[PDB]
Design a protein around this ligand. Structure first.
Ligand SMILES: N[C@@H](CCC(=O)N[C@@H](CS)C(=O)NCC(=O)O)C(=O)O
Ligand SMILES: N[C@@H](CCC(=O)N[C@@H](CS)C(=O)NCC(=O)O)C(=O)O
Ligand SMILES: O=C(c1ccccc1)c1ccc(O)cc1O
Ligand SMILES: O=C(c1ccccc1)c1ccc(O)cc1O
Ligand SMILES: [Ca+2]
Lengths: 241, 241
């Protein structure tokens, strides 16, 4: 009965995680875009004092999203939201029931957050060399079951956590968006098309094929256009050596 | 019934997290120290291919820790281990049952990992400025229940995740450990003794008072001596800004 409102933005992979999870849960919920990076509403710190997207409200009285109520629970951090949605919709099996397989899902999420996401940040926002990122992606790929399936076998929130980032990489590369040089851009594209990364391409296809992805993705070209609005992606700018 | 082996190191706050959780669970477990920073055993990548402490094996046949079995599950990443221990020992109530309180624990852990941990690492091991660490710590304090109590009210794995780092900060500061400037040392010592930080000092006292901390801590002086073995804590080097 308790309402869910997700404050969102199309460019944001962190918001995308939570939308995918709500889709897989079969939840009833509201999304409300926020221009967090250019024109933050002055009421936004009431739903998240960290001034980051996503933000979530839960319960309280039904109110327009730009008039959040003090009675709703204010939930921050995308992975905490993923675990919360799993807790709220236990019959949707957003996590395995078996402890070791659940652990595989939590490990995959931590591998992405601890070793991969910062390399994406380095390469795309600072234009540092791509090799440490390719190395971290090979490590992540290796945590996948090699003969197919999702991170923990069956689909789980761990795949919600990771696919927003991997799904952005390919079209952003094809647009040359990000502070890396053309040389590293070509090197990444060749690498991500090579047999070294066949397994992660299968993984990206399997995740994108689910309705939770189709329903929360603007389309490749539209997502590239939203990403061009991100100040830190510095459209037209590239660093060399 | 299945055996648990935790591969540990006294200096490591990551390994400390998992010991605390295993104490709180009432688990039967083995610990095995690994000189991971100065002399890794050749067999250790068998228990963690990432070559990081902690490492955990679960189930398989009962074997000496330095002869790990192929048959045991290999669980990496300390936060995944905390969730696993909660999953294995539900009667221990290592997380709340209420979904919103569970989200408070997950949020606290993410706030610590995403905004505070890296500041500890960078201030202590790189000597970066202390002000952003103090800001991150004031943010994390603000997430605590104001009147007293642990991150989600009752004790949970969120407190296992955070106390290893907060509890090291104070004796590290007093012993003068880390690559930050004299001026930033004085600054952090005055800050952490000031009224601004009274709530986090009570949190630290409350976590430390539990047997789970007492039985997993070597003592302040002993922990300071272990930290001194860390190569990156190069004695006599300081950075200035
Ligand atoms: N750890 C946070 C990260 C969220 C995040 O960094 N969001 C970006 C958009 S992709 C943002 O809102 N930045 C605004 C700011 O840094 O204050 C989460 O997982 O939800
Ligand atoms: N994110 C990991 C971090 C573990 C980690 O960085 N451990 C340090 C010791 S405190 C380590 O083992 N370093 C050896 C290495 O990085 O290869 C976890 O939470 O378990
Ligand atoms: O948008 C991206 C992005 C996604 C995929 C590849 C490169 C960048 C992104 C990546 C990290 C991050 O911390 C914040 C972000 O918005
Ligand atoms: O030991 C510490 C540490 C603990 C308290 C204050 C400063 C540092 C530690 C902190 C981050 C990290 O990534 C690895 C580490 O060993
Ligand atoms: Ca508060």
């Amino acid at each position: 009965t308790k309402q869910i409102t997700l404050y969102t933005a199309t460019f944001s992979p962190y918001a995308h995680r939570v939308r995918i999870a709500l889709e897989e849960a079969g939840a009833e919920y509201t999304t409300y875009d926020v221009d967090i990076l250019r024109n933050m509403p002055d009421w936004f710190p009431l739903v998240n004092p960290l001034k980051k997207i996503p933000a979530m409200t839960f319960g309280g009285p039904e109110v327009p999203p730009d008039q959040p109520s003090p009675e709703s629970a204010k939930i921050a951090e995308s992975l905490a939201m993923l675990e919360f949605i799993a807790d709220l919709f236990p019959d949707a099996k957003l996590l395995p029931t078996d402890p070791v397989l659940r652990a595989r899902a939590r490990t995959f999420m931590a591998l992405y957050e601890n070793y991969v996401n910062g390399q994406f940040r380095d390469v795309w926002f600072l234009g540092t060399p791509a090799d440490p990122l390719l190395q971290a992606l090979e490590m992540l790929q290796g945590a996948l079951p090699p003969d197919g399936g999702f991170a923990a076998g069956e689909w789980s929130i761990a795949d919600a956590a990771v696919i927003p980032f991997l799904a952005r990489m390919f079209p952003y590369l094809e647009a040359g968006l990000g502070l890396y040089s053309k040389e590293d851009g070509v090197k990444m594209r060749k690498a991500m098309a090579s047999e070294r990364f066949a397994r992660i391409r299968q993984y990206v296809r399997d995740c994108r094929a689910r309705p939770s992805f189709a329903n929360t993705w603007a389309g490749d070209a539209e997502q590239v256009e939203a990403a061009k609005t991100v100040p830190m992606l510095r459209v037209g700018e590239h660093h060399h050596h």
